[PDB]
Design a protein around this ligand. Structure first.
Ligand SMILES: Nc1ncnc2c1ncn2[C@@H]1O[C@H](COP(=O)(O)OP(=O)(O)O)[C@@H](O)[C@H]1O
Ligand SMILES: Nc1ncnc2c1ncn2[C@@H]1O[C@H](COP(=O)(O)OP(=O)(O)O)[C@@H](O)[C@H]1O
Ligand SMILES: Nc1ncnc2c1ncn2[C@@H]1O[C@H](COP(=O)(O)OP(=O)(O)O)[C@@H](O)[C@H]1O
Lengths: 56, 371, 371, 371
């Protein structure tokens, strides 16, 4: 009689696995984006200090 | 037919066809051999990996460079490099294509002679030609005068050219380059505990250098800024994890180019050998040379190196001349681009060293007016 | 012809033919001798029982293991074991079949030499070969890199392999295994009154261990859960009747693998010798090793041991790497499966030690490149 | 007032007074803690044993080394080592004694900074100074030029000095030393049947190494001599009887210094790093460097090390040179002897770092001119 319990557990497990996969996908995406944006801002900031000493 | 343009360099092979805008095969000039025993039978593993494959198998191999400072020291390794370049990266038969090779000024003559002998006997090319790297850089830059500073990975050299005439007595060559900068960074990174000793951690240190190092416009002020603040301190993530933090040695590494006493050398910085080459040239081409100071090669790719070079040369030269430094974004490939231009020039098709000329005059035919 | 694959191990003999999916003869590696007098004339009873028959006559015999920790200590007993394996379980003539034997890393050399001498003089095989257990485990796992943790019944060892090259300086060997876990369980089962002292009650305790023990994902929380509840307490029925109830020592037994101080050893757990082997390897293969952590051998068959190992190694290694633990269901037979694969490889038929090679070079020929 | 010379080393603390001929206190730099429970009430036993005492209770304790490769890893038990040195071995109050400490080249900066912070705040010494070990070795040897190889227990380094000027770009540092040799000997004895795993058995193995190992003049010929004769076997007596006999292992252990690939390192032997450090130096001083090759430190004490190293460096250098290896009998104390000489100089009494100097400039004052 516990087979329905087993099947329901399998279903919620599958749902949670899909959820985890989607969350990992969004995580790696946003992390690549944040790292790239930080690279750009650091580069251009150093460039700003260089053009500032240039102006000086 | 088409000619190949193989810019051997010292630490990065760049090959392609004459008439293209860029090389189609850029890979490290390394040859790796396994140093452990190897247990899995049936693995059938090779005995030496060349090029970009060795960088994948780093953790298992010992990486050796066959070119120390322009000069080739391991001829079997260099022959493997060329075989890989011809057959695996380009996929061409070298017995149907002329080949243009490049070399730095003031190398031994046996280097060039043995290179020619290899290219005619082993690879069996129909023609070949050895060109100077700085001249080809000036071709690619669009100039016809100007003093070029070609800082590769083995050597650094200035070659002043005016109206297409080179002034050989004013050629300068310095043996400080990217390899010495990598060794200095390996050495000064131990002040924070990081230790890189293996021949395969040198590649990690080279990556750190390329991605984080920069030239300070003023060295004492950046020293003080790093001593006080922490705004210039940046992090890097090793292949293992365990991020490392780089402080003021972001700009102490390339400062060795302007203060070669850091690595115990006697000579003067690049800003000063450039000026000494100028002042060794004539008096009535110095204004043009000051105005056409051309940079090329990978070691000139640091952020701020052009501004630093200009500040220094400006403080050196008289106060009444416009000092200008030409630093294109495609600096690293300037020698190859110029080589492609030259080999495509229709006027050049009479400057090749044909195979019959070689067969009749020996390898000594390389130092003739084709020099 | 076909080769035999005899995975001697230490506490379980596994033999078969090269080219099968599983061993066809798995029996304990014990030799029993009667300890009582024997009254019925005409019984004609034997003087020593080998293998699975001794486990039937347990109550009358003294059971001895001829292999302590990988190392063979009783050569006459081991020769009886091999004779039984060849003639009674497999029913083959060993003078027609090559034989592949297995051994653990870092054993004495006389072990391997005397094994070879026996296999050529006594059993008269045509060829033979001694292989390392971890390499064969990696064959059976389908990998070619990865750090393998082969916890048998005598020894535990890590052997990191990358691209088919083994890194011998990073091999670790620990003398804690299933036999020590059995002794610890015998000892801590006395807290509830059960006493198992005979050499034949050790087999009952081993059965209890196999059927009831498991690894706790967190040790203090399971300690508290057992102190409060009774939901983790389970029962077992001896060969005599009189069921015994096992409480929190269901998970205190295999916890000795992660806290060898329980049995008074100095060393560190398996989760920590694995990580130390990693950190002793290079820097640019550590990511692959973290991702390919392979388990094999019978002592890795506890429920929850993979999850525990992953939790521990994950808390040890840097936070930016995917740590993965490969634990197949047919772990216990991985060494044998890999041995069959290897001996069936056609490339391997040149790695055997033929009989003429031995006759001409002595038993020292075992430590040569066939090592 | 007199100064204290504490050559903390890595594996032996040597302390004494400046102006003496030898260190007064020499004991292992070890902190032991009990790993068993302790039953006798009233024993009043303490929590951690330091130094030479911890070797008497070695069987009960688990021994830690607070210095790994020159670098200090554990700081609390290093304060314990220093406290024991000052109060229990020398019986001096450090509030009125300047203290001279040594350190290896190319170490982290935080090592020195924390060392001086501790020596000024925890012990309140009036002055202190951190010296390089190789320079002190040259002082004690009586030279003023010469390339010094200082093989301790954690680190090996070469420091070429000419006319009193050290050439820092030619300083080599290698992390192969006596502790790595002990570990290789532990791992290599296993093949003969003996197993030493505990940190308390590592000390027994270190004793075996010190009393029986030696450097072979020709490695292959000695391997053949051991494979044929038996005139190499010597026997050692463990603390509990149980005599053990070793052959090959007598000279296979210190051969790791000349072939670091035995323990899986990539670097080159001590002979080759000595030669490379010479070739990094200017061409004019290589004569004197070849003629003044000074050995010091404990790991240079094997019989035959000087003859072997002379043979190697002679086969490396040109045939015109006179290679000489200076190896005094009081070799392993040369750093301390030189330190005493140095702190005893009247010219030195203005190169200490004072208390108020530190209080005003912070711990960063260690790297500045007060070196
Ligand atoms: N962005 C960068 N910043 C600093 N150094 C760089 C950069 N890119 C490349 N390099 C250095 O340039 C060297 C390669 O120069 P390259 O032009 O390839 O000369 P060659 O072809 O003779 O090796 C490498 O050693 C590398 O360290
Ligand atoms: N399911 C299990 N759970 C826990 N331990 C087990 C299990 N199955 C076998 N073992 C242990 O594994 C040991 C045998 O391991 P094995 O792979 O046979 O090594 P060997 O072949 O060297 O004896 C036995 O001592 C037994 O206690
Ligand atoms: N007679 C000897 N032969 C070989 N090795 C020795 C001998 N005596 C000491 N050693 C080794 O030297 C090391 C200690 O060297 P030492 O000069 O004390 O360096 P440190 O002071 O940094 O510990 C020990 O690890 C020991 O193994």
């Amino acid at each position: 009689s516990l087979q329905k319990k087993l099947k329901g557990t399998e279903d919620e497990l599958d749902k949670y696995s899909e959820a985890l996969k989607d969350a990992q996908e969004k995580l790696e995406l946003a992390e690549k984006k944040a790292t790239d944006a930080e690279a750009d801002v650091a580069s251009l900031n150093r460039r700003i200090q260089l053009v500032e000493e240039e102006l000086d | 037919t088409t000619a190949l343009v193989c810019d051997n360099g010292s630490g990065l092979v760049k090959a392609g066809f004459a008439g293209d805008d860029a090389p189609r095969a850029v890979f490290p000039s390394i040859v790796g051999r396994p140093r452990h025993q190897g247990v899995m039978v049936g693995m059938g593993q090779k005995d030496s990996y060349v090029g970009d494959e060795a960088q994948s198998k780093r953790g298992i191999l010992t990486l050796k460079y066959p070119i120390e400072h322009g000069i080739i020291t391991n001829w079997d390794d260099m022959e493997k490099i060329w075989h890989h370049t011809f057959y695996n990266e380009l996929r061409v038969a070298p017995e149907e294509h002329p080949t243009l090779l490049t070399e730095a000024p003031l190398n031994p003559k046996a280097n060039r002679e043995k290179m020619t002998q290899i290219m005619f006997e082993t690879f069996n090319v129909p023609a070949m030609y050895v060109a100077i790297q700085a001249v080809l850089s000036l071709y690619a830059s669009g100039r016809t005068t100007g003093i070029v500073l070609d800082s590769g990975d083995g050597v650094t050299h200035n070659v002043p050219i005016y109206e297409g005439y080179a002034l050989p007595h004013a050629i300068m060559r310095l043996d400080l380059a990217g390899r010495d900068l990598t060794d200095y960074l390996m050495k000064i990174l131990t002040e924070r505990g990081y230790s890189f000793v293996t021949t395969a951690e040198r590649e990690i240190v080279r990556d750190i250098k390329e991605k984080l190092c920069y030239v300070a416009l003023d060295f004492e002020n950046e020293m003080a800024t790093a001593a006080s603040s922490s705004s210039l301190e940046k992090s890097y993530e090793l292949p293992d994890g365990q991020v490392i933090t780089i402080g003021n040695e972001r700009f102490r590494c390339p400062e060795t180019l302007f203060q070669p006493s850091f690595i115990g050398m006697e000579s003067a910085g690049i800003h000063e050998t450039t000026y000494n080459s100028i002042m060794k040239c004539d008096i009535d081409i110095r204004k043009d040379l000051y105005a056409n100071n051309v940079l090329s090669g990978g070691t000139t790719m640091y952020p701020g190196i052009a501004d630093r070079m200009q500040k220094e040369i400006t403080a050196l030269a008289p106060s009444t001349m416009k000092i200008k430094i030409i630093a294109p974004p495609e600096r690293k490939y300037s020698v190859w681009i110029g080589g492609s231009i030259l080999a495509s020039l229709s006027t050049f098709q009479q400057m090749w060293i044909s195979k019959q000329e070689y067969d009749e005059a020996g390898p000594s035919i390389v130092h003739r007016k084709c020099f």
